[PDB]
Amino acid sequence: TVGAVALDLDGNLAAATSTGGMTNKLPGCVGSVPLVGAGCYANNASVAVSCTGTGEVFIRALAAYDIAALMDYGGLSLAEACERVVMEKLPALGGSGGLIAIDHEGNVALPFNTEGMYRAWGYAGDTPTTGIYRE
């Protein structure tokens, strides 16, 4: 699974996600990746999210929309919405993985509850940050 989220200079949000799925997967099975609100969501009013992890769980939890709704309706900050979904709701459904999110205000979050998540982020005209492991 791979993904990207962007805020542009016009203030527009977008999200994209792509995968080959799980090694040895049953032909015809579909995880969260291609499912709007599970593996991928963006709305200029909230957040752009791209998700990676247990598809069954990311679908049942609507991981990516849940970030949006928690912010839009709940009044959670991105940091708060990300902790809630990735560190609490997804583990209690048996979900492992993480996500990348950018909110309309340009806050960036890269939460994951796994050992690692291949990831990078940068502000325009700034130097990038990369990561594999925690911290």
């Binding site: 993904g3 994209a16 709007v36 990078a120």
Partner: protein, 158 residues
């Protein structure tokens, strides 16, 4: 706010124990180049939507990441790929699931978004739509790598 990109190439059991620095650096170098390309497009005034498309197209091309080239194998030693893209402005979206003959499923997903009255297309149906829009047909053999084949054998019995 400030224009910004985030990318990922997957989450899970990545063990510090299991890698050399040279191995780690191949992933850091890949990630850095892709995020740097997106930072350059953003800075030039390209849309979030075009930026998240090219980033995911580069992560697809990158054989280290499980999407497009380097996709994992199915139990039948096939590849079946899915992708999604969403425009936060228009709230338009597009997706493909179960495609095996499209090199860049995030491009097929952009095509569903921008050139159809639909959000999601699957299988040969999705492929036939894309070919009809002039998207090029490939063999699913293009996605195969030894790394991912090795992981397949390691996971099973002969």
């Amino acid at each position: 706010g400030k224009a910004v990109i985030a990318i990922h190439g997957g989450a899970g059991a990545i063990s510090r124990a299991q890698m050399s620095l040279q191995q780690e650096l191949r992933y850091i170098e890949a990630l850095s180049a892709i995020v740097e390309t997106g930072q350059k497009m953003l800075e030039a005034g390209e849309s979030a939507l075009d930026v998240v498309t090219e980033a995911v197209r580069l992560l697809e091309e990158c054989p280290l990441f499980n999407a497009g080239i380097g996709a994992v194998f199915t139990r039948d030693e096939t590849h079946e790929l899915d992708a999604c893209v969403m425009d936060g402005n228009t709230l338009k979206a597009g997706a493909v699931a179960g495609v095996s003959h499209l090199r860049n499923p995030v491009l097929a997903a952009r095509l569903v978004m921008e050139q159809s009255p639909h959000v999601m297309m699957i299988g040969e149906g999705a492929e036939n739509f894309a070919f009809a829009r002039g998207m090029e047909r490939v063999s699913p053999e293009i996605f195969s790598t030894s790394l991912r084949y090795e992981q397949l054998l390691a996971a099973r019995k002969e």
